[PDB]
Amino acid sequence: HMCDAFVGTWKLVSSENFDDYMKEVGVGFATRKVAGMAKPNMIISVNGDVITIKSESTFKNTEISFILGQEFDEVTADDRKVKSTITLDGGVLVHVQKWDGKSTTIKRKREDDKLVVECVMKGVTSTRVYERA
Numbered sequence: 001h002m003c004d005a006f007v008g009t010w011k012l013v014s015s016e017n018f019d020d021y022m023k024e025v026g027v028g029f030a031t032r033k034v035a036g037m038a039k040p041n042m043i044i045s046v047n048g049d050v051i052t053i054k055s056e057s058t059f060k061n062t063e064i065s066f067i068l069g070q071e072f073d074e075v076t077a078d079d080r081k082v083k084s085t086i087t088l089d090g091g092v093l094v095h096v097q098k099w100d101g102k103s104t105t106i107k108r109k110r111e112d113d114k115l116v117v118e119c120v121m122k123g124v125t126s127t128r129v130y131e132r133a
């Protein structure tokens with residue numbers, strides 16, 4: 001029951017500072033502009049200890065499956081090859097991605113009926129707000 005309140009199908013409804021977050025990460029112009037239009041569906045499910053998170057949109061369909069605390073390989077929507085570790089900290093899913101000596105953290109939090117996603121790269125934060133689909 002570790003992630004019960006995250007499980008479901010969620011749809012992006014608002015974004016703030018996302019272009020600047022992508023810039024900070026190193027995403028190129030064309031990907032930023034196209035990817036910035038997308039309104040992804042985030043689909044979270046749990047089976048035993050395995051959590052699966054899918055992101056489906058016009059831009060890209062991605063899927064990760066993982067066990068909390070156990071590092072895995074991930075190819076991100078913007079084609080970075082990263083080493084990812086996802087943990088639960090005080091009820092927040094904390095996803096750290098490492099590549100090329102860089103690091104970014106993505107936090108997923110339940111707030112009221114929303115799932116609020118905070119993406120941080122150095123001093124730049126972006127907030128992506130999802131509602132139930």
Ligand SMILES: O=C(O)[C@H]1CCCN1C(=O)Nc1cc(Cl)cc(Cl)c1-c1ccccc1
Pocket residue numbers: 012021022025027031035036038040055057059060076077078106117119128
């Ligand atoms: O898209 C999101 O809301 C954020 C928070 C959850 C994971 N996530 C990303 O990895 N976003 C993204 C993060 C980066 Cl640096 C670049 C892109 Cl292209 C996306 C992206 C954009 C549109 C659709 C899919 C991915």
